[PDB]
Amino acid sequence: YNQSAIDAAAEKPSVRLTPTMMLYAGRSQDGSHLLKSARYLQQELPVRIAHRIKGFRCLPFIIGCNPTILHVHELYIRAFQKLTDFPPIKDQADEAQYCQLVRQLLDDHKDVVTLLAEGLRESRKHIEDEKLVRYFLDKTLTSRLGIRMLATHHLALHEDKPDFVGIICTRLSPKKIIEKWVDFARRLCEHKYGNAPRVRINGHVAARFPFIPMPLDYILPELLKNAMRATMESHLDTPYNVPDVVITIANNDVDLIIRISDRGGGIAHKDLDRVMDYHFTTAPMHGFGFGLPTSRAYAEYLGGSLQLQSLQGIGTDVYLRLRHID
Amino acid sequence: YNQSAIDAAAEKPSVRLTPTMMLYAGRSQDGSHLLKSARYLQQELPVRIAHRIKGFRCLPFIIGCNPTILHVHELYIRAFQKLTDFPPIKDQADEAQYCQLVRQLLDDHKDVVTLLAEGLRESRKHIEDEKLVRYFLDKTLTSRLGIRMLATHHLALHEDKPDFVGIICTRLSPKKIIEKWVDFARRLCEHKYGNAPRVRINGHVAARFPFIPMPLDYILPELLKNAMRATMESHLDTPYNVPDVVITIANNDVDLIIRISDRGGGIAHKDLDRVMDYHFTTAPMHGFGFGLPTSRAYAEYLGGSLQLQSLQGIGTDVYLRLRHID
Numbered sequence: 327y328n329q330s331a332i333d334a335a336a337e338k339p340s341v342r343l344t345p346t347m348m349l350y351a352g353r354s355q356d357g358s359h360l361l362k363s364a365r366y367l368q369q370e371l372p373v374r375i376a377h378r379i380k381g382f383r384c385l386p387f388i389i390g391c392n393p394t395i396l397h398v399h400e401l402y403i404r405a406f407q408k409l410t411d412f413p414p415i416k417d418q419a420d421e422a423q424y425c426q427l428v429r430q431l432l433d434d435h436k437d438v439v440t441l442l443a444e445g446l447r448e449s450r451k452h453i454e455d456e457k458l459v460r461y462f463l464d465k466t467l468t469s470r471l472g473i474r475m476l477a478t479h480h481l482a483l484h485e486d487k488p489d490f491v492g493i494i495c496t497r498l499s500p501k502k503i504i505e506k507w508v509d510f511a512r513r514l515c516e517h518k519y520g521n522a523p524r525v526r527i528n529g530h531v532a533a534r535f536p537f538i539p540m541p542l543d544y545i546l547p548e549l550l551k552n553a554m555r556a557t558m559e560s561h562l563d564t565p566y567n568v569p570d571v572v573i574t575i576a577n578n579d580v581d582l583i584i585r586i587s588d589r590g591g592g593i594a595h596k597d598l599d600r601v602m603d604y605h606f607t608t609a610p611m612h613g614f615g616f617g618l619p620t621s622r623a624y625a626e627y628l629g630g631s632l633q634l635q636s637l638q639g640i641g642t643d644v645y646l647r648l649r650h651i652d
Numbered sequence: 653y654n655q656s657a658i659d660a661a662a663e664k665p666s667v668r669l670t671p672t673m674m675l676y677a678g679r680s681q682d683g684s685h686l687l688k689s690a691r692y693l694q695q696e697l698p699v700r701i702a703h704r705i706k707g708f709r710c711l712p713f714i715i716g717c718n719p720t721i722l723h724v725h726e727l728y729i730r731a732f733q734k735l736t737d738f739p740p741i742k743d744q745a746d747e748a749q750y751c752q753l754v755r756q757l758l759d760d761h762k763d764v765v766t767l768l769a770e771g772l773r774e775s776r777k778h779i780e781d782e783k784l785v786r787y788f789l790d791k792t793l794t795s796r797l798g799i800r801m802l803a804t805h806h807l808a809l810h811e812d813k814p815d816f817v818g819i820i821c822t823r824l825s826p827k828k829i830i831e832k833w834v835d836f837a838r839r840l841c842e843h844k845y846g847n848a849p850r851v852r853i854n855g856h857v858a859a860r861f862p863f864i865p866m867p868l869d870y871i872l873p874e875l876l877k878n879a880m881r882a883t884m885e886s887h888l889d890t891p892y893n894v895p896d897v898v899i900t901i902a903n904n905d906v907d908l909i910i911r912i913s914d915r916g917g918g919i920a921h922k923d924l925d926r927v928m929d930y931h932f933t934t935a936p937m938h939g940f941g942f943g944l945p946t947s948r949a950y951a952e953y954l955g956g957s958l959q960l961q962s963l964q965g966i967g968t969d970v971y972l973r974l975r976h977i978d
């Protein structure tokens with residue numbers, strides 16, 4: 327690329343808007359909170375993009391040369407250009423034009439991860455470091471989550487969604503968000519297998535607290551698709567009589583724990599170390615190998631964890647932990 | 653100590669009798685299997701003792717000087733002397749005299765761990781390495797388990813216990829051994845709290861396989877005492893209505909998994925890193941701090957693991973894994 331403008335922002339450090347600082351925006355009888363947030367987003371978005379362009383520049387030359395990798399690298403450069411070229415936000419007209427660019431760039435970059443994984447897969451013969459692919463995809467996925475959180479938050483500040491301040495839900499019920507995806511995952515499972523296991527939810531079912539549901543909107547359907555597929559493939563002779571998937575909610579002052587326990591035979595000993603690798607699968611629902619590593623990258627980025635406990639021959643317990651807001 | 657006889661056996665490596673090699677002893681119409689095993693035990697017992705005397709010699713001087721530590725060190729030296737002084741086993745008379753010495757030495761050393769922990773506790777002010785105490789107690793406990801397995805196996809070869817070849821049960825049912833300790837632990841819990849949680853056992857309830865129950869005879873009552881105490885202390889207002897402790901058996905070709913799931917509020921975040929430390933407790937049943945670290949040292953020595961999964965505010969799932977025989 328050899329661009330000096332990008333070099334300037336690759337070294338300047340990132341600024342993360344804390345959940346409490348995000349909530350401290352509600353100047354309704356003025357609209358001054360809208361401009362304050364947009365002025366931050368305008369400055370922060372190119373820094374995040376440049377930090378990732380730096381990652382593409384640090385890829386070994388032979389890999390960075392792949393036409394698909396180069397295309398995604400080019401996309402990140404043009405995105406940085408489009409964002410920095412925009413003049414500073416002064417009024418409601420300057421804020422509105424930025425929101426349109428952000429929405430277009432959020433749609434132009436929707437398939438970056440799929441192109442990146444393909445480019446990296448195509449380059450397997452030249453990849454010497456086994457961790458290279460995992461660390462590059464982990465960092466790309468978490469950078470995008472960070473960007474998508476800031477961008478979606480500012481765009482949602484224009485909506486008057488009940489119980490929400492942008493992307494922060496002030497009254498989130500973990501039981502309701504689980505229920506929302508349980509019915510969705512059962513429909514996908516029913517389509518493939520003719521049936522789906524019934525889901526039972528116990529624990530702190532009435533817990534309510536402020537939280538950002540965005541990461542849970544990815545993790546929960548992925549973990550439910552895994553638990554349901556496994557339960558069906560291990561009860562092939564009785565597809566009509568499959569054991570329930572039991573979800574437990576544990577809410578304490580430190581974190582939120584969601585445990586998903588299935589009776590799907592568990593993860594085999596030989597596969598136990600490969601399940602967290604990108605592309606690894608034993609099979610859209612399945613046939614991807616992204617659900618587990620992406621969900622862990624997500625949980626860890628947000629101060630939590632994704633831990634698996636396999637009981638080979640019986641089932642698996644998946645523990646999703648996420649740190650509380652503030 | 654400065655004893656040259658012990659120096660000779662501290663360097664000679666250990667020989668471990670594999671489960672299949674132990675089972676290959678049943679020369680009933682001769683009694684030749686009895687002498688072959690005793691001739692091994694006579695040679696192996698001083699090597700194990702010397703390897704541990706070497707550990708006492710490697711303790712920092714200030715700690716090894718503690719009167720309690722010195723007493724246990726002296727006990728190990730006198731044990732090595734008594735065993736090596738015995739003349740080689742040639743007939744049924746020479747085998748019988750060794751069995752009496754082994755039974756006496758197994759009774760003389762019954763309180764070694766309690767004296768050792770006390771001596772180490774007394775020396776806390778001089779202990780600089782935090783891992784020193786954990787590693788010394790882990791190595792002492794596993795050495796003793798190894799010795800107790802060999803000694804008890806040979807002594808049990810004289811018994812005609814059904815479904816057993818010394819200490820190996822040919823038809824072990826994990827459900828039955830769990831049941832055996834469940835009623836025992838409930839009696840101890842009832843004595844302290846006025847009630848105990850009912851225990852539910854599911855999974856591979858009818859699994860049967862060859863196995864050494866000795867380590868399970870320690871781990872299961874300890875893990876059940878922990879799950880029951882926790883369930884009672886978290887349901888103080890309703891001691892009469894406490895949630896069940898649910899045990900799941902998973903039997904596959906690689907290992908045996910026993911999961912103990914309680915609804916006892918879980919292990920607090922602040923205590924989560926200290927629970928595996930010797931002496932750490934939040935309180936004979938309780939007030940010891942040995943149950944968890946000893947059980948893990950045991951599981952790992954036998955090619956398995958002891959893993960804890962805390963759901964703070966709800967309960968804890970404890971996963972005991974043990975590698976299969978052969």
Ligand SMILES: CCC1(COc2ccc(-c3csc(-c4ccccc4C(=O)O)n3)cn2)CC1
Nearest residue numbers: 405428431432435436439467470473474477544
């Ligand atoms: C060049 C900077 C831009 C584009 O930033 C992004 C960030 C995230 C996404 C996005 C769309 S769908 C999505 C996703 C969802 C679930 C799980 C994984 C992903 C993922 O693909 O990362 N993220 C798109 N553009 C602000 C203009």
Ligand SMILES: CCC1(COc2ccc(-c3csc(-c4ccccc4C(=O)O)n3)cn2)CC1
Nearest residue numbers: 731754757758761762765793796799800803870
């Ligand atoms: C000097 C070598 C000897 C003595 O060897 C041992 C080994 C083990 C034990 C023993 C008794 S009770 C026991 C225990 C049970 C459950 C959990 C922990 C322990 C423990 O104290 O290690 N182990 C005693 N003497 C063969 C003559």
Ligand SMILES: Nc1ncnc2c1ncn2[C@@H]1O[C@H](COP(=O)(O)OP(=O)(O)O)[C@@H](O)[C@H]1O
Nearest residue numbers: 552556592607608612613614615616617618642
């Ligand atoms: N609950 C589970 N029980 C059994 N196997 C599982 C479970 N969750 C995941 N797996 C295994 O891990 C593999 C990778 O999972 P994942 O990353 O979600 O991708 P996918 O399911 O789309 O292939 C799966 O193909 C499956 O073999």
Ligand SMILES: Nc1ncnc2c1ncn2[C@@H]1O[C@H](COP(=O)(O)OP(=O)(O)O)[C@@H](O)[C@H]1O
Nearest residue numbers: 878882918933934938939940941942943944968
């Ligand atoms: N199932 C459990 N639920 C909650 N706390 C537990 C559980 N198991 C162990 N603990 C905690 O770990 C501490 C140490 O346990 P352990 O080593 O068994 O010793 P003890 O229970 O005799 O004190 C206990 O004092 C208790 O605070």
Ligand SMILES: [Mg+2]
Nearest residue numbers: 548552617618
């Ligand atoms: Mg998946």
Ligand SMILES: [Mg+2]
Nearest residue numbers: 874878943944
């Ligand atoms: Mg205990």
